[PDB]
Ligand binder design. Structure first.
Ligand SMILES: Cc1cn([C@H]2C[C@H](OP(=O)(O)O)[C@@H](COP(=O)(O)O)O2)c(=O)[nH]c1=O
Ligand SMILES: [Ca+2]
Length: 141
């Protein structure tokens, strides 16, 4: 934790975006896929369901946002660095834009998994979801 000052923000290079909630970044030389902490996007794959309303689109935001971005950083919480899959969870940042929250403020996502204490950003995306719901964004539509 040295001086850092809480959570640290590490650069990274965008490789390939899967959907709203998941992408492959080159965090410290080495390809790796990442999961968005406290956040869920309408399922997109797994037949165990099908295209969740706002699914395809829900992924038509994270992609570019990352592509249109010239640089991006990753913020590790305080809990586990990755989930039982090899996919690390963080609020991936894009030009100071909280994708996880960005997507939340947009009605393209829901607040899922708040983990203790790997959720040092709860409230934040919470107020947003309330705003995207107080008006009726996509889902909450
Ligand atoms: C976001 C998140 C997902 N996970 C795991 C739980 C879920 O398991 P299960 O798939 O078996 O239901 C899965 C949901 O991630 P997806 O939104 O990619 O499905 O990832 C965590 O353990 N901690 C997390 O913060
Ligand atoms: Ca999802």
């Amino acid at each position: 934790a040295t001086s850092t000052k809480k959570l640290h923000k590490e650069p990274a290079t965008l490789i390939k975006a899967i959907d709203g909630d998941t992408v492959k970044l080159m965090y410290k030389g080495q390809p790796m896929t990442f999961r968005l902490l406290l956040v869920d996007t309408p399922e997109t794959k797994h037949p165990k369901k099908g295209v969740e309303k706002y699914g395809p689109e829900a992924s038509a935001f994270t992609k570019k946002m990352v592509e249109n971005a010239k640089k991006i950083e990753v913020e590790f919480n305080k809990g586990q660095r990755t989930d039982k899959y090899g996919r690390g969870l963080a609020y991936i940042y894009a030009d100071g834009k909280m994708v996880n929250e960005a997507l939340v403020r947009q009605g393209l996502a829901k607040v899922a998994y708040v983990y203790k204490p790997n959720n040092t950003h709860e409230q934040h995306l919470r107020k947003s979801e309330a705003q995207a719901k107080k008006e009726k964004l996509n889902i909450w539509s």
